[model samples]
Target: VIRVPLPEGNQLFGVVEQALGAGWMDVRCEDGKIRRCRIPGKLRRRVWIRVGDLVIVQPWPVQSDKRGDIVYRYTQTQVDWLLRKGKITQEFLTG
Candidate 1:
């Protein structure tokens, strides 16, 4: 798994600026920082990251100059499977 520190100041968020490829995109963050990032390989097919998808990401800590992981994609089964596989750990579990 990859890790990134949340950006300082007014955290970034925006509609994708453009789609470079099926596996990459550009985001115009809240701070007006336009950055290119890769869509996770696994989600490339299942997740249709369209030109206007509202995605959330965590920026790379050390690189400070490369792509970041797409942290959230609101898919039901994908989230469930991730939870079941221990890929993501939640603070609380509900029945």
Candidate 2:
């Protein structure tokens, strides 16, 4: 078993909602706001994510509500573990 990384101070857990077609995605945050998050070339180049995937994001100081950067994508089992641990509400759980 591996340790799952959770949102740190000011960070957030998000659900990938839709791809914006420019390497950006619409994310549903825990705080009930949607964000336009960039996957970043460095991360997306290495990871391929899909709609409803759980991700770790650090909101931009300037646009914390509607903009952010994706830092991580939780694996399938990792998400299951997170669900078991109550890291997220049942509403955020998706396939």
Candidate 3:
């Protein structure tokens, strides 16, 4: 089963900044940090994400500022719902 867990511990929120090929993306985090993140094998074939998508990420413990793993990608509907529900900030909506 495909599952996207809520942010816990090191997991944080971010938006896709660029769609780098080969399952990699540059993400600008909610905390004003940018990280190069990758889709792990489990999510690779199951999910399709693009630039500007809202995502949940787990920052690397060793190089948090530089690298991370993409844990979840929110669909457009989900994002809009989150905006309406006030679950996510407006600043993260447009980008």
Cα-based lDDT for every prediction: 0.54, 0.89, 0.84
lDDT of 3 by residue, 1-95 (tens): 33334578978789999988898999998778989999998999899888888999899988988899999988877777667767688877565
Candidate 2 clashing pairs, residues 3+ apart or interchain: none
Question: TM-scores, in order shown?
Answer: 0.54, 0.93, 0.85
Cα misplacement distance, residue 69 of candidate 1 (Å): 2.2
lDDT of 1 by residue, 20-41 (tens): 8767787654444666777777
Output the TM-score of candidate 3.
0.85
- What is the overall TM-score of model 2 with all chains considered together? 0.93
Candidate 1 regions with alpha-carbon error over 4 angstroms:
1-12, 63-66, 74-95
List clashing residue pairs in candidate 1.
13-30
| Better model by TM-score: candidate 1 vs candidate 2 | 2
The candidate that wins on lDDT is 2
Order the numbered candidates by lDDT, best leading.
2, 3, 1
lDDT of 2 at 80: 86
Once fitted onto the true fold, the runs of candidate 2 whose alpha carbons sit more than 4 angstroms away are none
lDDT of 2 by residue, 1-95 (tens): 57989899999999999998878999998888999999889998899899989999889999789899999999989988888999986777652
